């Protein structure tokens, strides 16, 4: 994290610095900063354009009106000014629609922004890859920005993979089908105990956090299938340290 | 005829033109047009990207390869699975405008 | 993406007309800048979302695929060697073939005309050249429809990719079972239990 | 603020040491000698230590000469206090950056790399002329030097002006020395016309008028066709003992100062420096498209035809009515040219009758052919001449940066990169895809097809 | 394209013809009429293009979330993945500038 | 849902004006086409909505 924040901050510190545009474009700093650039430019651009519109002598004798009034009789001056009037209002209209377009868009943005802060910031969200990129969004930060906010979504990316063998389930004594109740888990044996000791471990379906399973994590199943591991009752304490053979204890 | 100038490095490193030739000793043919520069080499790194095309800083032109994304292991019920592990937490950037003035 | 030679779209290269246009400041320039900005953006994000996994591409052909009770013949895209420069390609799925050929008035988007022949200028000029001579350029699609298909194939492969490598391409029945247990733990998956869904 | 020189003049006070001098109110700095590459560190900060503006620092402790690149940055950088490329200070390394391209500091031993900051414009002498219009209050300097001949680095608190013959290009034949009593204007009217015919970068436009046809923009940038191509530049400081007939269709016959294009001009621009030239009447005589001759008389009187313009006043004290006598057989009247403005700076005229005055088209009448001068600048009047430079001029499209209705900087459009720039509106342009026109026939020579 | 056909209250849509038929002042006056017409129509084309650009931008966003949260894996968001019901999964095929 | 008879709207119902209107060709058609397209899309999507 310290790495990433600092050297992203460096990415801020310059443009095309060190040719580090492997992180180029969307979801990268350059994309966001560019966007903000056009953001800050656009308002002044539109306003200036609207202002500059009015100098165009829109089909009239002049870009100003009292000259029209003075030079000719009012009736004709009215005639000419009509064209200027129409030009001015029309440009206003086009500007207006453009502005509303912007308002519509940014309104969509803020809607999403409020969603983002809810779903991503105030808690980490299970919806995959939602928080500005794929992977498990641990959390995110936010910083002010011209008319906007920048969001910094922390997401894990594995560096390795553990090729384990998953177990569909168990059938002890070919009698009792016992299976993990929780879909989000995986039962396996791996590491030195992948096949040497068959030490059974349950870990996240999402990621690698192995530990010994518990009978509390299992449940009965009506139908065995050939995928299920054959098992014996004495193997139940072996498979599960948490199993208890009630009959022998009695 | 209309043409495009690849004003990168604050320079016209290349010109996209329907015309076959230009005042460039280097020229590559594209499926839709011609590109003329002082570098027709194979643009490994697009210093600028546009449509499916990328341009290097020397006037080199090429096609931008798609960036492969992070692998997500599809869920299964049994068999062999590569459980992801030893995660580095990277930060992705996302700016959202909040309002117009 | 579409670009325009606003300068010629108005002046058509008429020098005196160009001088007159100069007084209209950057309105034309702002227009063209906005156009290219939108185009470059569009490009950058669409390239961003497009991420393709090679293992998925492996599993993505029909032969590679194991549509166990899942008849994907129209679903998947056929991958064959393309005599076009010795490269192997995966042709788009039969469904997408129907969608394009029957829907697209020209069947496919590769009909995008090169302006190279437009610069040929020997024979008469078509509509594409008519508009190009009006200063209208049609930038080709940022991403290939074939790239789109292979991306979809990558999506499907990742759908059926049970591991980090190609050694974990489980039968799709297993994936269906997993997703079902995700939405609801199964007390009994009979052969009919899965098969009925498959055949329906 | 030229280099004060190593021995000539008063000057001296050469620092040229690791003494790390820190003087205020400095507007010129020069290094005339890095002994190969031995260190040189300059920190130019606003004296009140204001981080709001962009700080400036140059650093080269390494002694690789060509590869001992002076890390240069006009950026909101650490206002370095004692020594070091960053050091302990205020402001972080990347607070705000304007320019940071580390320009290599390779130079000859007697070569001088210098920077001057004045009039909110910056000139840099790092192997070239880097002239820019940019705000600056940078009178704080903290240095580190390695002694090189005792005359390596100096601060410059006063402007020194060197007259250069330039008999030869290069270190040889410049005949450089602080000279002439025509200090400012003749240092602000001369230039070395580029072989293409342009003003060399570094010109400050002491009096140069942008040609606004009706009303002048106070501030901004405009692309327009203005006569910025230079033909046979003539820069004679306060001497015109000449009876001359400037004629179009002919490259103006004079001692062409810079690498002039020997082109028959269509316009001509002045950097006049004495006003009494106008008092010496006959300074403007004219022959127009009709061939009608034309006189110019300026004097306090307002009626040639009711009174004599025999001037009873000298050195103005009255805006002298300029009347313009028609000199054809059936028209011999004095048209009122203009009430003499309080102070003229530059006058430009064009082939097609454009009498242009101080950014204004007073007449811009039908085409002129013979713009003939009789300014009685003879005898002691050879030191009374207002003629200080005159340059034949060809129209050229260029982008002009101006502020406070004062010319700041220029950019021609002939070069394709420059063509795109002037096709755009900003001198600088961004890396992207830009529209462009296929190059037509440079020679128009369009055949007729009917 | 068809805008160039429209002689915007000028005597012709041919700039060179206008120069031919008029003195420079009046010619520049008339050509300005079509100059304005061309510029205006072009502007409207611009805005509508941006309109489409914007909406398709939102569209591709939606597709992106749909693929991530449904295609990449079935969503707990009931009804979200292309309608109500127990959406077990979904499959995507290419389409002109789009996806199924 | 709103539509307009472009032809009579502009031509005031005058065919002699429709002569000139035809010269703008799809200028008239595109308006109404898009209008009805949006209307029908809205109708179908909200019918499926309910
Ligand atoms: C204030 O406002 C007035 C209003 O008229 C301006 O006067 C005009 O200024 C323009 C700006 O340069 C002049 O344009 C020049 O015209 C010259 C004469 O025109 C002939 O040549 C052109 C071009 O060949 C023909 O189109 C025309 O029909 C004439 O035959 C030309 O010599 C100039 O052209 C140069 O460049 C072209 C290439 O573009 C070359 O082929 C030419 O050989 C030449 O090198 C240029 O076109 C215009 O002439 C002025 N009007 C009149 C009546 O002369 C003022 O300039 C303006 N500013 C002030 C007063 O400061
Ligand atoms: C077409 O013309 C251009 C413009 O001259 C050529 O580009 C540049 O050509 C020089 C001359 O060789 C190349 O310089 C070489 O590499 C370095 C650069 O400093 C140095 O060791 C020498 O100067 C050496 O000559 C330069 O790299 C090259 N730049 C490019 C290609 O971007 C070009 O080579 C010409 N030929 C073509 C394009 O086929
Ligand atoms: C966390 O990271 C920050 C970076 O933001 C570190 O703060 C920085 O620490 C330096 C140490 O002095 C501060 O001064 C700088 O020192 C260098 C070296 O002397 C000098 O060259 C610079 O000019 C500057 O004076 C700096 O202001 C400060 N902040 C920055 C760089 O933004 C901090 O040390 C880190 N801490 C941990 C626990 O990781
Ligand atoms: C043009 O530039 C000159 C720069 O020298 C500005 O000052 C004028 O400079 C000349 C130098 O040749 C002075 O001439 C000298 O005048 C004194 C007395 O007037 C005389 O004793 C000397 O022998 C010599 O001839 C001139 O006086 C001086 N002008 C002054 C002091 O007002 C000039 O202001 C610039 N003008 C423009 C319009 O650019
Ligand atoms: C250069 O100037 C000389 C006149 O001598 C100058 O005196 C000073 C003004 C000094 O600054 C230098 O310019 C000169 O030393 C002009 O003619 C030369 O005169 C000298 C005098 O003996 C003679 O030896 C040379 O041969 C002359 N010619 C030269 C130097 O080319 C000369 O016209 C001026 N300009 C040029 C371009 O040389
Ligand atoms: C566990 O025991 C069951 C029951 O014997 C085994 O299931 C048999 O598998 C073979 C393999 O082809 C079939 O021919 C038999 O018909 C199956 N008998 C059944 C289902 O009653 C199973 O193979 C054993 N091992 C595992 C891992 O399940
Ligand atoms: C040069 O650039 C082109 C891209 O336009 C690449 O094209 C290859 O050219 C060789 C020449 O014989 C062919 O055999 C290959 O099949 C081409 N590759 C493809 C994918 O079609 C080429 O790879 C580039 N050269 C490099 C990168 O060294
Ligand atoms: C981090 O990734 C490594 C690489 O697979 C995992 O294994 C390490 O491998 C290196 C290779 O020489 C050994 O030196 C280390 O002892 C191994 N373990 C560790 C903790 O580094 C490693 O397990 C991964 N870390 C985590 C927390 O999963
Ligand atoms: C799986 O799908 C394929 C094609 O999607 C089916 O094969 C086609 O069936 C039609 C039925 O009329 C025949 O006309 C075609 O000749 C068949 N082959 C093609 C289109 O290549 C097939 O029947 C489906 N079921 C399977 C294979 O069990
Ligand atoms: C995962 O897939 C592989 C291939 O489909 C299965 O087969 C093993 O492949 C590896 C090579 O990668 C060999 O070393 C093993 O000997 C193979 N297994 C057997 C039983 O021979 C593999 O079993 C699967 N499961 C894993 C790797 O845990
Ligand atoms: C910052 O990013 C670049 C590019 O990925 C990387 O090479 C560098 O090591 C990173 N630095 C830190 C401190 O994370
Ligand atoms: C002044 O004008 C006369 C003709 O009017 C001309 O012969 C002479 O060359 C001009 N100049 C001088 C200095 O007499
Ligand atoms: C113009 O110049 C040409 C060539 O220099 C010459 O032949 C012609 O006579 C000149 N005409 C005038 C009116 O100066
Ligand atoms: C004065 O006018 C006559 C004819 O109008 C002409 O021949 C003569 O050249 C003019 N004077 C000068 C100095 O050119
Ligand atoms: C001046 O012009 C008029 C107009 O034709 C003419 O009648 C008269 O003779 C001219 N004056 C002369 C030639 O002195």
Numbering used by the authors:
A (entry chain A): 1003 to 1252
B (entry chain A): 702 to 802
C (entry chain C): 803 to 1002
D (entry chain A): 52 to 501
E (entry chain C): 1053 to 1152
F (entry chain B): 803 to 852
Q: Could you share sentences copied from the article?
A:
The trimeric spike (S) glycoprotein of PEDV is responsible for virus-host recognition, membrane fusion, and is the main target for vaccine development and antigenic analysis. The PEDV S consists of an S1 subunit, an S2 subunit, a transmembrane domain (TM), and a cytosolic tail. The S1 subunit can be subdivided into three domains and two subdomains, namely the domain 0 (D0), the N-terminal domain (NTD), the subdomain 1 (SD1), the C-terminal domain (CTD), and the subdomain 2 (SD2). The D0 modulates the enteric tropism of PEDV by binding to sialic acids (SAs) on the surface of enterocytes.
We further obtained recombinant S protein of the PT52 strain using the porcine IPEC-J2 intestinal epithelial cell line, which is the native host cell line for PEDV. Having obtained the recombinant PEDV PT52 S from the IPEC-J2 cells, we subsequently determined its cryo-EM structure to a nominal resolution of 3.1 Å without imposing a symmetry constraint. The structure exhibited a D0UUU arrangement as opposed to the predominantly D0DDD arrangement for the intact virion-derived S protein structure. Through 3D classification, we also observed a minor conformation that adopted a D0UUD arrangement. Orthogonal views of the cryo-EM maps of the D0UUU arrangement (a) and the D0UUD arrangement (c) with their respective atomic models are shown in cartoon representations in b and d, respectively. Instead, the T326I variant populated more D0-down conformation with the 19%, 16% and 42% of the population being in the D0UUD, D0UDD and D0DDD arrangements, respectively.
